[PDB]
Symmetry: T
Subunit: 134 residues, 12 copies
Amino acid sequence: LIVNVINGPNLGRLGRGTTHDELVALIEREAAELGLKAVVRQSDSEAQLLDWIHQAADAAEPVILNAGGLTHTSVALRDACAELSAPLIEVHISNVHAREEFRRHSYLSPIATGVIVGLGIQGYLLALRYLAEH
Amino acid sequence: LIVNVINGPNLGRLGRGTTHDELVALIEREAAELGLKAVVRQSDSEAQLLDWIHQAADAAEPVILNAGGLTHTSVALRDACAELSAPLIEVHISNVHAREEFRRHSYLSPIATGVIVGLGIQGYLLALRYLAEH
Amino acid sequence: LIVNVINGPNLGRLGRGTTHDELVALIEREAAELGLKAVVRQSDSEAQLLDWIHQAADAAEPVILNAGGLTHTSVALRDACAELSAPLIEVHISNVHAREEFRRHSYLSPIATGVIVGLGIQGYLLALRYLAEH
Amino acid sequence: LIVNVINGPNLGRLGRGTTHDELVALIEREAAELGLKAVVRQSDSEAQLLDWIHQAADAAEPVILNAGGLTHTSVALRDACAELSAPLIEVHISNVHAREEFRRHSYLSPIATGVIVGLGIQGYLLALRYLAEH
Amino acid sequence: LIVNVINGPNLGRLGRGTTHDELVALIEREAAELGLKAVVRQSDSEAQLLDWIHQAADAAEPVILNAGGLTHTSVALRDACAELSAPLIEVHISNVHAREEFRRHSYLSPIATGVIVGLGIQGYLLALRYLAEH
Amino acid sequence: LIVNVINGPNLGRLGRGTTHDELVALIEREAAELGLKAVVRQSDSEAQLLDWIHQAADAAEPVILNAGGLTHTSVALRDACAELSAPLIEVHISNVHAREEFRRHSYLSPIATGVIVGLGIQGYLLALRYLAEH
Amino acid sequence: LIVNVINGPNLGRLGRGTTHDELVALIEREAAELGLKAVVRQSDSEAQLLDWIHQAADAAEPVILNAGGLTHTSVALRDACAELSAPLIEVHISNVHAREEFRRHSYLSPIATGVIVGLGIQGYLLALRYLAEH
Amino acid sequence: LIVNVINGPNLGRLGRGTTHDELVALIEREAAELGLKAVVRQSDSEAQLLDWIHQAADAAEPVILNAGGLTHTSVALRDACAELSAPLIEVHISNVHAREEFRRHSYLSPIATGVIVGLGIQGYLLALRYLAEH
Amino acid sequence: LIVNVINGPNLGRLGRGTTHDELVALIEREAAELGLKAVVRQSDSEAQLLDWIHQAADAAEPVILNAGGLTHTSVALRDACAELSAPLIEVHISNVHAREEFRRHSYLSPIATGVIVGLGIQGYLLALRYLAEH
Amino acid sequence: LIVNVINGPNLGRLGRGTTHDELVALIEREAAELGLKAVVRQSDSEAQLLDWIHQAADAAEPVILNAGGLTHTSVALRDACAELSAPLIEVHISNVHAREEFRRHSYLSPIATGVIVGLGIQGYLLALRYLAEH
Amino acid sequence: LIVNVINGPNLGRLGRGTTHDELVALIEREAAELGLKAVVRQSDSEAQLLDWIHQAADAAEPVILNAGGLTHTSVALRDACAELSAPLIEVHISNVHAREEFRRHSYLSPIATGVIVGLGIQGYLLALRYLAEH
Amino acid sequence: LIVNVINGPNLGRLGRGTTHDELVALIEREAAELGLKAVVRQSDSEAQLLDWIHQAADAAEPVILNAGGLTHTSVALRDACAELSAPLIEVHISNVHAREEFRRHSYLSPIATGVIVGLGIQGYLLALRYLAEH
Ligand SMILES: CC1(C)C(=O)[C@@H](O)[C@H](O)C[C@]1(O)C(=O)O
Ligand SMILES: CC1(C)C(=O)[C@@H](O)[C@H](O)C[C@]1(O)C(=O)O
Ligand SMILES: CC1(C)C(=O)[C@@H](O)[C@H](O)C[C@]1(O)C(=O)O
Ligand SMILES: CC1(C)C(=O)[C@@H](O)[C@H](O)C[C@]1(O)C(=O)O
Ligand SMILES: CC1(C)C(=O)[C@@H](O)[C@H](O)C[C@]1(O)C(=O)O
Ligand SMILES: CC1(C)C(=O)[C@@H](O)[C@H](O)C[C@]1(O)C(=O)O
Ligand SMILES: CC1(C)C(=O)[C@@H](O)[C@H](O)C[C@]1(O)C(=O)O
Ligand SMILES: CC1(C)C(=O)[C@@H](O)[C@H](O)C[C@]1(O)C(=O)O
Ligand SMILES: CC1(C)C(=O)[C@@H](O)[C@H](O)C[C@]1(O)C(=O)O
Ligand SMILES: CC1(C)C(=O)[C@@H](O)[C@H](O)C[C@]1(O)C(=O)O
Ligand SMILES: CC1(C)C(=O)[C@@H](O)[C@H](O)C[C@]1(O)C(=O)O
Ligand SMILES: CC1(C)C(=O)[C@@H](O)[C@H](O)C[C@]1(O)C(=O)O
Ligand code: NA
Ligand code: NA
Ligand code: NA
Ligand code: NA
Ligand code: NA
Ligand code: NA
Ligand code: NA
Ligand code: NA
Ligand code: NA
Ligand code: NA
Ligand code: NA
Ligand code: NA
Ligand code: NA
Ligand code: NA
Ligand code: NA
Ligand code: NA
Ligand code: NA
Ligand code: NA
Ligand code: NA
Ligand code: NA
Ligand code: NA
Ligand code: NA
Ligand code: NA
Ligand code: NA
Ligand code: NA
Ligand code: NA
Ligand code: NA
Ligand code: NA
Ligand code: NA
Ligand code: NA
Ligand code: NA
Ligand code: NA
Ligand code: NA
Ligand code: NA
Ligand code: NA
Ligand code: NA
């Protein structure tokens, strides 16, 4: 039923095409179509992201996570995500493999159920659809 | 309209859960639902895979590619895929980031539109859905 | 007399065996037995940890620090800890050397007085005992 | 006209020679002499630094940035700084090349207009003078 | 009841502060206070160290081990230590992380229960106290 | 009073914008304004550069050095520069961190007082101003 | 009873001492002496090797494999070999450790039961003898 | 007299400027002018390339080889080429040193007589001319 | 006629399945069957192993060597083994390639005639059989 | 019309077979046959080589360059060569890929039109022929 | 007056040219000529070498040390040698830089006064002469 | 009879203890005592050093070479030195192994007869004595 979509640093700057408010609206609409409720949250603060992941761990709710630059750098976020019992889908809007070498390593991928990159904002919608069939 | 799904070495051994024939049937059914025609092919021969990629290049048809172990090893396959003008979506059934370090490098990812890993056979269906909306 | 025990990200999630509140109680009891006063604080926010380290620097108070994942990643925390004049003991509950390779590097160890790993929550109590004899 | 000077973690601890309040006063005085207005801000919180960089991006204002330890570690800060359209000058008080090897890599340098290191607090004043002539 | 304390090469040269004979006396006194019997042995010969570890394996006795330079170099010692069923605590007098890079790798740490470094000879006494509570 | 500005290989090719003769004129004008005398010299010969550095060592005169490609390659030049007692400021016109990886290492930076990169020819003028206040 | 001996690229060129036909005859003779039936096959085509490995997986038959240069390069072959339930013995005629560094890594060794190198064609016969006693 | 020109994977796709059929015609014309007979063959199959190299080894005929992506990846092809007694000239149309780092390593170069890169299809003609004078 | 079997550190601990005394008995029985005399020796002391290798060098006798952890670490043992004129077969009971990365390098393999790993104690018997046919 | 052939350090020592004077004569003869004028120069001085490259840049003349050991070491020479507008062909007499690993990296190759190695002094003549057809 | 010459593993095998007994005689003769007394000792046992180094530390006597393979591998020997107050000269008979890469690193060189390699047994005599003038 | 002593960049700056003129005098005196003639030359120019090495190659005269920083950087100097038929002794005044890591690699050591480091100016005199006995 409930799916958490958690966006990390700089994702509030989307579109400055699709803005973060637009993304929320798109996700909510898709979720309803699939019979799910999407809770979409964004923060530039690692501590706030950690708190949202802790809550999803306690509730056994799935998480779709685009951690922004913290993907590549945060062991703390990995440690929190490792506690999740429900699925964790990592999403990147851009194809990180076509950019700098440092973007090709993720602390999150090894502990995620799966990873979608380079499909733009549709990545989020495809992750929802995976969770609805699972 | 037409989407090519190309599976590389050892993918004929799926299920020995879901068999390769079953996967073909699942993909075909999903494609029809989306208004697409899926052409699904599998080979253990790099040369045969190259030929199928060349044909998709000449026809300007999108490709969903699970190259199996060649993902990690074949520059020749990368070179062929670089010629494609329509989208290229790389799919892995397993989460390659939760396995050996060598599986975490792909010669294909940098030249793909995007990459889906770890979502099992649903990865193929989600890639179809991306192409139908694009 | 006064010893600061500072716990970083995810340490509030201990026990979800020993909870963080239990750990506080254990530390306080041991401190009193040794003739010390323990001030035990936890935060998921790097900025908050930095502030507590700055205060210990200004007061010339010893610090027992379990920085969680920031151990492996934060130069900022190292820089703050380098200002401490009293002893700094790094503690990890788990044996970081029996886990992923990335956990085997610490930005803090080179600037600490010493390091205790893998002795569970007793590590904290043993660090207190070192400080009481020093 | 307006230049933002942004100082990151631990820079509030300057002088505990020149204190952070003194640095602000020095910068403001130099700015006025050059016909500029300097807005000088410091934070130990990455999220707060990100917000200030976002604002400078939206206003098309130049930034002089001493990110402290985040220089070496934060992809998130790089990503925010990449959005700036006006110049970005990276400043370090110390000569990072005469210290530990890890300080010799910066996530910011590749995206900065230029970089001044090792000239102490005069680095800030020299960066102002560059911006006044540009 | 019985704890073996095993010191490797060059540890007989302690104090030429605290000498190796003094260390033995300190350990024995602490052990008695904790209700334990400490058997403290030192050798510069890897073969002799191996024999003492084999005996502790056969007797299921805990070991506190400061292997000196062999920490960094001996796979043979690791292999012997891997046979121990009771706890193994690695101790270094100095903080190996504040010295040459080569001292920051240990063949023993991954197979130890835990590791104490940089607390001087008190490290041995703290390891005894861990074993008495375990 | 006297400051030496030493330019290495290929710097005579500046402008083929600002030519090397123009740069000399700009530097001389700025120096006079600051109450300094600038001696500006350029050579493509490492031996000649070494001789000029030796002379500045013997006279205890400050040096502003843009060694061109020798920055990245010459231990001999580092060794000569290490003898200087007065300040040494390394200047690069381009932002070397936005170019090939090999340009991001300098044999000179560790032994320089400070380093200015990416501010174009103004880097030289800013280095003069540092020396006038020091 | 049945053992498959599979030789990869360039092994048909043996002796141009012992030729590949001679090797087949030697293996067959040894197999009969041990009460086994040896099926010896060679191909320069990875796809053909994969097919033979798939068949041995389906039949639960042991495999003695000299993959030639594919040893060092093929993840696809590793993936096929990982499916085998009966033993897999890797054989090299030459001592790969006395040659180029690249020959000292094998994608197959980690998944093999064991590995024999440098014993010439007797390696094959010794592998047969292992399988007869197992 | 006879020279073999062997082209590997994707070289049949030349011109989709100069097509592979055109290249054959150009080579044949140049060969005749030099008093040579050129046998030009292309395949996307490693096994087929191996067979052609084996035949050139048996006939003691020179080889001009553009192995395409296999240059960078195939130990099997190196092993076959090592058997050649007549000269082996490696040719690349593109300048592999101006592309991705992975293209700057060749398994073939160490065993070739020489290597021509970046001179386009004229590289083949220049290799013929070398063989005619040798 | 005479073959030396030399076992290094920790091999006396075999079976605490097959014990070291049992292994000796098995080897002796196999040797007699092959018309050989096996001299089997074990030591945890590198110096003692060196002496036995020196004696085999002086007598021009073949050696089957399982150096235990010294395989991975001892240049001294390599240097002694390099003096042997008769064959040297390296044996490991376990498949070192399926364990830690550090076990995948041997100082001995490059100087050995050949290497058998992962075939358990039968490895020793197979090495004897090689020497009997050679 | 005019082609510069520039030889770097130690190339004056050719033949102490073909001497440097002989090479000049061979090149001049070939050039005339092709309708070109070859200007062949050699120096052991990097500064002198730089000057000759600067002149070829100013005249928009092609360069055939064998930089000797500077190939592997000089960023200054790369920087000068990057200014050339006409083609730059790098030539090595020896096959650098069959020698020490350090010879397999060139600072020049990425900025050259193409590279010929291992064809002896004919490499120079083949480079002339490329330039005559281009 | 007294100089210790300490030879490590395998040095007793010299000449099986100059034997170890001959070397002793040569050293003793040279020492007497210089007014010194040479005590020359050899062992294959690290523990024995450590003891001899400890004694030289306690007596403040200079040491000429050829540690054989332990040069490259023993931190324990480095640690003992670091205690010496009188000079320490490292000697190798062979030129270790012309052999395998692993021989080009020494744990001893950084703590030695100096190092002589590749001058054969004369290296020992030259080291004596250094000590006589110092 | 004749020995060349060649000093590279910055060696003319010795003593600004022993000056370069003093070193020449010391060497000449020692040479005469040994029945040799020493020709001692110094230059900061690589080209000049190359010329002196070429002359020693042509005359078959031994060389004692302290190349200064070029030791670590010049392939050209290595190439010239490789031509020498008489002995080549590399000398460093300082112990390069006790300094920066980059000083621990020499392009010259592999091609030298031997190497003396860290014995100060006596290194030169000891090298002369080696050549007199050889
Ligand atoms: C571009 C984004 C949002 C980002 O912040 C980067 O640091 C990251 O490498 C990729 C990213 O998460 C994305 O493409 O979604
Ligand atoms: C398991 C598959 C099919 C494979 O062949 C592996 O080599 C590859 O690393 C991952 C893979 O492509 C997949 O999970 O789809
Ligand atoms: C498990 C803890 C708390 C942690 O957060 C990890 O990131 C770290 O590697 C180890 C750790 O600090 C610990 O074991 O105390
Ligand atoms: C010393 C400062 C402020 C810092 O925090 C360090 O992490 C950084 O490497 C250098 C630094 O930014 C500086 O010198 O300004
Ligand atoms: C200093 C000691 C004893 C030692 O022998 C070193 O090799 C090791 O790195 C650290 C050490 O074990 C210690 O500090 O106890
Ligand atoms: C471009 C310059 C002058 C140069 O020669 C390069 O080798 C160097 O990497 C940067 C440089 O010194 C500069 O930008 O001033
Ligand atoms: C020599 C062989 C057959 C081979 O093809 C090489 O690529 C490989 O490194 C070793 C090899 O498999 C062998 O020695 O059997
Ligand atoms: C472009 C070609 C043909 C190729 O297939 C690449 O994999 C290779 O790196 C270079 C290449 O062989 C060539 O430029 O001829
Ligand atoms: C397990 C043995 C005996 C050993 O001591 C390890 O150090 C080595 O990596 C492998 C080993 O020699 C063996 O498996 O025979
Ligand atoms: C042998 C030559 C001339 C040379 O000086 C080497 O440093 C270089 O690696 C190769 C070389 O340029 C050549 O083969 O032409
Ligand atoms: C050859 C010697 C004696 C040795 O034992 C090697 O391990 C070492 O690399 C060099 C050596 O010490 C020597 O040449 O004196
Ligand atoms: C100090 C010297 C002269 C030098 O120039 C350095 O570059 C080199 O690393 C060591 C040196 O050659 C020496 O100590 O003789
Ligand atoms: Na929720
Ligand atoms: Na990871
Ligand atoms: Na999209
Ligand atoms: Na199709
Ligand atoms: Na890639
Ligand atoms: Na699925
Ligand atoms: Na407090
Ligand atoms: Na560190
Ligand atoms: Na505990
Ligand atoms: Na502002
Ligand atoms: Na970067
Ligand atoms: Na300042
Ligand atoms: Na005991
Ligand atoms: Na380890
Ligand atoms: Na202590
Ligand atoms: Na001057
Ligand atoms: Na450096
Ligand atoms: Na400028
Ligand atoms: Na079969
Ligand atoms: Na592997
Ligand atoms: Na054989
Ligand atoms: Na043919
Ligand atoms: Na190679
Ligand atoms: Na062309
Ligand atoms: Na014997
Ligand atoms: Na080796
Ligand atoms: Na067995
Ligand atoms: Na010209
Ligand atoms: Na390059
Ligand atoms: Na030639
Ligand atoms: Na003595
Ligand atoms: Na070292
Ligand atoms: Na000698
Ligand atoms: Na001379
Ligand atoms: Na070298
Ligand atoms: Na001296």
